[PDB]
Design a protein around this ligand. Structure first.
Ligand SMILES: NC(=O)c1ccc[n+]([C@@H]2O[C@H](COP(=O)([O-])OP(=O)(O)OC[C@H]3O[C@@H](n4cnc5c(N)ncnc54)[C@H](O)[C@@H]3O)[C@@H](O)[C@H]2O)c1
Ligand SMILES: NC(=O)c1ccc[n+]([C@@H]2O[C@H](COP(=O)([O-])OP(=O)(O)OC[C@H]3O[C@@H](n4cnc5c(N)ncnc54)[C@H](O)[C@@H]3O)[C@@H](O)[C@H]2O)c1
Ligand SMILES: NC(=O)c1ccc[n+]([C@@H]2O[C@H](COP(=O)([O-])OP(=O)(O)OC[C@H]3O[C@@H](n4cnc5c(N)ncnc54)[C@H](O)[C@@H]3O)[C@@H](O)[C@H]2O)c1
Ligand SMILES: NC(=O)c1ccc[n+]([C@@H]2O[C@H](COP(=O)([O-])OP(=O)(O)OC[C@H]3O[C@@H](n4cnc5c(N)ncnc54)[C@H](O)[C@@H]3O)[C@@H](O)[C@H]2O)c1
Ligand SMILES: [Cl-]
Ligand SMILES: [Cl-]
Ligand SMILES: [Cl-]
Ligand SMILES: [Cl-]
Lengths: 258, 257, 260, 257
């Protein structure tokens, strides 16, 4: 029996990177369907077609827009007959250094909108639908190693990921009465279009810039490792796990220097 | 020698509550000038007058407005010839329950703006001035017990205070090269106009609703206790303390239901 | 059939004669483990559990986890008999029946708890690490901590100290052994009624509901030993290939530890 | 009024290093008396004489021996009329690397005995006397930066300091009903005879081997900084602070390799 057999999932930010890998893995693990919610429509549609349109749909959705998220969740539940897992994974990272001394406030606003407002909207709207359906559920936010430690730059992003932890803890306490679990996964070293904003483009960039700060050697980091943690948390394998951040980061000593 | 002798401080949100108590205590501990930065102008002027105009000045300032904060810091440093302590203390708490299932998003936006954008602005702008002056400095944010734990409501506020911790940690790492310390204080049980938004108006409300969740008994909680922690962190008593959250909360078991 | 997420792995479960350890040994075999060695001081019970799992895939070895020579011998036997050592679940523990408040702390009873729960952990992590480094195939070491590993309690002070010490061991070992592709993590239960929890009045699932569940957020999901076993199997497997230095709580979201 | 005016303190491990500095500072801050409880008798007597025999006494005491600790506390209370602050500061660090792969178990036992058994004994016995006297009190353990993070060696020591945090958290919850506070201080970079066991003897050693891992620059680390944090926690400045670890470590990025 596959661990997500028959389950309906949403993956926000599923057009690329960790979200795409997670959508793919959820289908491999028996999901009835995965809805990819993203702003990249051509790319999202192509990912859905690649996974297979009988088990994956793309919906255009800005996670920070509550009406768009509500509409996307309603469509998901009506189309596929439920909503068992929400993976609130969409995020952004600025290319500017974002040290606190030279913090660009408009760029801070952009990061906080997607990474904190989007998380709050997705957790709220998933929770409402899960409470309505009465079948419990599993809500997962994609935080990051910077959710529990400071960094030498990317200060807005660090603040946003700490805020996600606060959301997860609070939501877990508030929604547990309805058998809804809320957790986060925290990656670090997966090269994606997002990490390219801070110069991490290739597996070699990961080795040169990130791995000196990571304990676990001989295990190259991948998007699929993060997807595995999300699938564990989304499944009944984690039936009694809530309020928790699960890092998939090789043991981060401290965040890399600038 | 008094622990803040000769120091110049800014207290944002200093017109009321913990900020007012902290401005008062900083002067008692020898601060040469304390600037109260607040949006309550009438009240802030009256508080500065009560503390004494020779030691305390009021500047109208929305902490989330970077130009206003920059102007207020420039005025402080030009008028008094320094800036040793920034206490970024302003905050807001909505009267709505703010459960995540029924979260009011515009009210979330307000809380995040004051409590996270205001913190970021004040830390940035204080840091710039402290780096320019070359004398080190101490920056303190007012977080709260909800900065390190979840709550059963006030979800926006919890998120905002967690974000403050991330700011403090990051800023401490980035500004330590210039001998600038960054820390937070985390209160819980002081009845103020802010806490009135969630039904905590009197010391008796604190006893009935909050104290069951607090370990330390027989010590009534006060604004002055929080001010003492801020004065410790602002002073050379804490010369090698940075990146830290200092809770003044009697040992919180969990947030109230 | 389940996913054979532990296909071919050789595991040791200390404290595997009972409770969470027994459930974990059983689940590891269900998930395709080559073998599980149950290392325990309860010989009659341990032998019976091994026979119940199946002697072709499970062996019992008499072993006091705080005795370094016994642990070393048990690991050597495991590796020689089954050709490897891929997972160590350092799960043995003890809990006193005495309240163990700090004001009335019984020091000899503190010593007993610290011996099994901290010395035993250190011995098992050391000796598993040595064998894993020797074999050159990486590995996964898991300690059974508890919800009290990351928070204070109103009694059981020795036990709380012991579980905090386990977290320090896990963090340190993860940092030191990562160079050899060895992962070190903990699982932290709370609400499984076992002979150990009976020492503090938690004997039945109803005791769990009455005394523990008021302090736990997640409702409608009765707590079981098997839930903890699932977390250990996740951490022991390649599903957690890049997870190290971490405590994974299986506790329904603990608000705070229950009052005395 | 000085912050420890009239208070009676015990500093375990007060014959050397941070404990000595803390005993000295407590007297400077007005303590009625400080009892140095240590196993190094000649050294402890020399420290007490230097601080001043009218305000400081030495008592021979192995912190892991419950009868000796009880006797020392009884002597303190009989001699000086109370017990307001217990600083459970004694600790040891092996010279061996103590990696987990090559952990020496008898040396692990030594570290765990002083650093965990001694902490438990001192917190228990101070708590008993404080409950008896009915005046509240402040109990402080000396933990360390390794109390909240892993290290690349000294594994026994890391375990011991994590256990201290568990003790402090638990004791704070259990003793708050009697207005007794329990906290820790966590140093990192004070060169002492203890740190000499891992090659840290001089200010230059600190700069070369420890400071790369510490955010705060331009502020040389000292024993007196740790003493200041202990004095804050021991005093009414921290009247509503309990269950907390207060790091005096310049912001530790991670433990040194
Ligand atoms: N890659 C890493 O190592 C790493 C480390 C820490 C955290 N994360 C987090 O992982 C998550 C996924 O990022 P990734 O690295 O896979 O990057 P990615 O660029 O591959 O994917 C991010 C996706 O989010 C989408 N997105 C952005 N704004 C959106 C909005 N308003 N509404 C809907 N979708 C939106 C993008 O269009 C994109 O498809 C992010 O939350 C990121 O912060 C990643
Ligand atoms: N009272 C408590 O027990 C408690 C607990 C946890 C955290 N806090 C925090 O303590 C801090 C001080 O609050 P308080 O309880 O003393 O309440 P308070 O109402 O007495 O003071 C808050 C002050 O902040 C000011 N302020 C609000 N928005 C502002 C803005 N945009 N710019 C400048 N000033 C602004 C208000 O005008 C007011 O004078 C807040 O950050 C609050 O979140 C308090
Ligand atoms: N049950 C829970 O809810 C819970 C909560 C928190 C932590 N834990 C931890 O889970 C672990 C397993 O305990 P359990 O609850 O399954 O109890 P259990 O009594 O079912 O099993 C404990 C086993 O450990 C063995 N053991 C004790 N001392 C030993 C030694 N010196 N050498 C070898 N084996 C020894 C016992 O003989 C027994 O078989 C323990 O570490 C415990 O502290 C359990
Ligand atoms: N120096 C640092 O930077 C540092 C860092 C982290 C933690 N610490 C902690 O600070 C505390 C003080 O250490 P220090 O560096 O000042 O060391 P130190 O060696 O100068 O002082 C330790 C004192 O404890 C005493 N002591 C040892 N065993 C004892 C026992 N059984 N009973 C009574 N007294 C005993 C010693 O005789 C000595 O006088 C220790 O707990 C240590 O672990 C220090
Ligand atoms: Cl990150
Ligand atoms: Cl709060
Ligand atoms: Cl527990
Ligand atoms: Cl240390």
């Amino acid at each position: 029996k596959k661990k997500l057999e028959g389950k309906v999932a949403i993956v926000t930010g599923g057009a690329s990177g960790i979200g795409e890998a997670t959508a793919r893995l959820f289908v491999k693990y028996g999901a009835r369907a995965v809805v990819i919610a993203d702003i990249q429509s051509e790319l999202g549609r192509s990912v859905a077609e690649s996974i297979g349109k009988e088990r994956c749909s793309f919906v255009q959705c800005d996670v920070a827009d509550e009406e768009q998220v509500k509409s996307m969740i309603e469509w998901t539940a009506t189309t596929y007959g439920g909503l068992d897992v929400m993976f609130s994974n969409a995020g952004v990272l600025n290319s500017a250094a974002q040290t606190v001394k030279d913090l660009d406030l408009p760029l801070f606003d952009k990061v906080m909108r997607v990474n904190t407002r989007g998380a709050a909207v997705c957790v709220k709207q998933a929770a409402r639908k899960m409470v309505e359906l009465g079948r419990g559920g599993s809500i997962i936010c994609n935080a990051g190693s910077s959710a529990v430690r400071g960094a030498h730059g990317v200060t807005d992003y660090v603040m946003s990921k700490h805020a996600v932890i606060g959301l997860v803890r609070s939501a877990s306490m508030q929604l547990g009465a309805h058998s809804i679990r809320v957790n986060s996964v925290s990656p670090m070293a997966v090269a994606t279009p997002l990490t390219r904003n801070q110069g991490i483009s290739t597996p070699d960039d990961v080795q040169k810039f990130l791995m000196p700060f990571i304990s676990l050697k001989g295990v190259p980091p991948t998007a699929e490792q993060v997807a595995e943690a999300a699938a564990f948390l989304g499944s009944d394998e984690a039936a009694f796990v809530t309020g928790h951040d699960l890092p998939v980061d090789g043991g981060v000593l401290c965040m890399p220097f600038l």
